[PDB]
Amino acid sequence: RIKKISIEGNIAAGKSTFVNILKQLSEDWEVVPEPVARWSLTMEQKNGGNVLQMMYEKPERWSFTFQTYACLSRIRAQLASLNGKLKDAEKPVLFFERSVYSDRYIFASNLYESESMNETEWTIYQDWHDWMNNQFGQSLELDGIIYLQATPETCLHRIYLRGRNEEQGIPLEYLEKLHYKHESWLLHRTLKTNFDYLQEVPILTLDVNEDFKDKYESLVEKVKEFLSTL
Amino acid sequence: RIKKISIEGNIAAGKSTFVNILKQLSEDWEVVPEPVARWSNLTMEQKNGGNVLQMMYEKPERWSFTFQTYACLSRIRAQLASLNGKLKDAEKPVLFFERSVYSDRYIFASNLYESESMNETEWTIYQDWHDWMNNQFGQSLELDGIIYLQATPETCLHRIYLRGRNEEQGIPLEYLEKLHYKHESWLLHRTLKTNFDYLQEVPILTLDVNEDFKDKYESLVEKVKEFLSTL
Ligand SMILES: CCCc1sc(-c2ccc(OC)c(OCCO)c2)nc1CSc1nc(N)cc(N)n1
Ligand SMILES: CCCc1sc(-c2ccc(OC)c(OCCO)c2)nc1CSc1nc(N)cc(N)n1
Ligand SMILES: O=c1ccn([C@@H]2O[C@H](COP(=O)(O)OP(=O)(O)O)[C@@H](O)[C@H]2O)c(=O)[nH]1
Ligand SMILES: O=c1ccn([C@@H]2O[C@H](COP(=O)(O)OP(=O)(O)O)[C@@H](O)[C@H]2O)c(=O)[nH]1
User: Which CATH number do you get for residue A194?
Assistant: First the structure.
């Protein structure tokens, strides 16, 4: 009964920003932030922190392990949020900061294509993904995708603005690549997924090139109309 | 009503041989071969497993964690499948698992980590994942008992020569030796800590299988039926 909406977009595009905004605006709207974001006390933070640093230094060694733990943490986190909150809500919405589909068809895919995962790992991961989402992940099924579309330069600049030590070393080239896989999934609908229902999930796309922190009403007005057509 | 019983033992201790003898005594009795045994010679799984298997042999410190997660997923999937697929009609169903998810973690994944083939982060992520999932199933795969085929590492070493697999012909004696202690500790001395609540009180049948039993197995089988009636 809770409506499940993935916010999707490139690194430093503004999702944490958009989703922080939205949640304040109705007691029937809650967010599930992205595990990876929290990694940059708990054993998951601890595990998260190490594997992310590991990943930065040697991605062709750590990428399969990193993608495995990121997806798992997300599945877990979305469940915690779902089976917990919003049970007394009139019009409940959970906004996910990315989805298990980003995990795979953006990030993991890019790492296969860029040779930081070899073929065995990628098909091991794909097998792990196809089946972890079917055993325990079926209640996570999205009612909508919201795509926060923004330039690779926007993001580099926005990376700088946030000032995460490790991210400043991230270059335009990767952002371009990551920028490139989103468009193919969310705009053209070029992507065959192993999850057919995604063929029918309605998408909304939102231009976040312009700063929106003092000026998001048109942005939130667009979401509001989306939600009532789902 | 399905009873789930795990058959545990070192490399070449006699698990499959025994299980194949057990499957034939009872229309009521079924078996789940362990998948790394099947890769230990094909589907998409069998493709990945042969590949990941050979890579583990080539360089364990790089592939342990990858091998471990995939072996256990592949085990859990075939074991969920039997419970849903096998033995539907039978009046007293018993499913014999060739090894278990506890042997994945507390014998093999633990030992690779002790042998420094997985780091703390590889180990703690493995364990986290092993729980989340093996708490998700709430009693479905949980064991009713266990049968430990007991051999000396020395018997085990011979048996690999008989079995004849090229790619297994260098497993050294000391490798078989650490796994022995892990079995011995876990299932005979019962000194191994595990995080699984019911498993401290899981009944355990120890059979010495050092003597060739291919053509002389009746007495073993009597302990199994004997053991099975207590459940
Ligand atoms: C946001 C920090 C996560 C990182 S770190 C990283 C990285 C760092 C350094 C790299 O080069 C040395 C690198 O190159 C990839 C090599 O092909 C990737 N990529 C990533 C993106 S992969 C990813 N997968 C997810 N599933 C989720 C998520 N947020 N990110
Ligand atoms: C017998 C084929 C499976 C293999 S291969 C292997 C191995 C191979 C080469 C190695 O280095 C040369 C190796 O070194 C570990 C040294 O401490 C282990 N260990 C194993 C046992 S780990 C295992 N984990 C499971 N979960 C299941 C299972 N049957 N085996
Ligand atoms: O319209 C915007 C959206 C975001 N930001 C800034 O861009 C950086 C990255 O934003 P966010 O943390 O939302 O990135 P994401 O969650 O997409 O990785 C942050 O320091 C924000 O303060 C901004 O200046 N204008
Ligand atoms: O009583 C026995 C038991 C086993 N074996 C042989 O020893 C090898 C090891 O058996 P198996 O593969 O069943 O052991 P597992 O690894 O399954 O425990 C095989 O070639 C068996 O044919 C034997 O000669 N006599």
Answer: 3.40.50.300
